[PDB]
């Protein structure tokens, strides 16, 4: 296909609302990503959102265009992929990549929240890599504001991927966006250093989340995961988000702070 000055060859993804194509300039070759979206006010926020967007651990937007129904969405391409295709089955990654990782993903949240905004649907699929490994943080489909004016907006909107889910949204009528954030990159942590996701849903019917809960780290994915990291994932992994730890204390944790290398 062609349109206006760009050919779309590869599809590179697929979301509830369109798909991503690799465009490649007919003119100058200059290599994006651009999410193709047939047809409400929720396009109108998404490309609103993106426009407010400047940080090396979120992708890049370009602009967007039209052709009556179907949108165009210009986004910088993540020549290596994403993380969700860096995690080993029943294994993971090397320890060092997982907290150089860990580092870029608070950098990108720190960054969010600090605009206001909340991605609201962090897991390995979001989290793309440039050339040189750097994490950037994509799709803005469900992303909402949360802060404006230094005013913060209690969320109620029940949105993401129930594995990566923080409890407070099957729980609660209305909550913080911040916790929900940080409880989605915790299960991103416990991903990259097992290969495998802890529970379908934290929830009470759901044993492997029980069993979290009764401290049984006999059990995996825990068993997999070194102590250091392990007593992070006890203070992000807290049912109650008033008690769950914040970012800037993220950033005082051992394991968090510990020299790794190999
Ligand atoms: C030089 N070279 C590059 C390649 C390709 C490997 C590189 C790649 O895939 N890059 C890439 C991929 C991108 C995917 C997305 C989307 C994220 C969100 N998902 C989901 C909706 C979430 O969960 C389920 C769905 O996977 C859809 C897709 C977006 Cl917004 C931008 C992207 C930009 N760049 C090959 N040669």
């Known amino acids: 296909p062609f349109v206006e000055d760009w050919d779309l060859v590869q599809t590179l993804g697929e979301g509830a609302y369109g798909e991503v194509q690799l465009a490649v ?8 990503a651009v999410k ?22 979120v992708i890049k937007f370009y602009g967007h265009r039209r052709e009556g129904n179907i949108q165009y969405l210009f986004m910088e391409l993540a020549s290596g992929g994403s993380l969700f295709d860096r995690i080993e089955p029943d294994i993971g990654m090397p ?5 150089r990782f860990f580092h870029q993903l608070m950098a990108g949240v720190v960054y969010l929240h600090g605009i206001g905004i909340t991605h609201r649907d962090i897991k390995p699929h979001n989290l793309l890599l440039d050339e040189r490994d750097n994490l950037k943080i994509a799709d803005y489909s469900l992303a909402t504001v949360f802060r404006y004016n230094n005013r913060e907006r209690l969320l109620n909107k029940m949105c993401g991927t129930l594995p990566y889910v923080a409890p ?10 911040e916790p929900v954030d940080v409880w989605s990159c915790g299960i991103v942590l416990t991903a990259m250093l097992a290969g495998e996701l802890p529970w379908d849903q934290p929830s009470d019917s759901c044993q492997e989340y029980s069993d979290w809960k009764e401290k049984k780290t006999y059990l995996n994915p825990w068993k997999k995961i070194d102590s250091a990291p392990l007593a992070l994932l006890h203070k992000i992994l ?15 944790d051992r394991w968090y702070n510990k020299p790794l290398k190999k």
């Open 238 to 252: 807290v049912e109650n988000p008033s008690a769950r730890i914040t970012i800037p204390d993220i950033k005082k």
């Open 168 to 177: 407070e949204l099957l729980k609660r009528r209305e909550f913080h966006a």
């Open 25 to 32: 300039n007919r003119v100058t070759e200059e290599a994006v």
């Open 95 to 99: 320890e060092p990549d997982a907290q």
């Open 36 to 57: 193709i979206v047939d047809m409400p006010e929720n396009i109108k926020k998404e490309i609103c959102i993106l426009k407010m967007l400047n940080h090396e651990n």
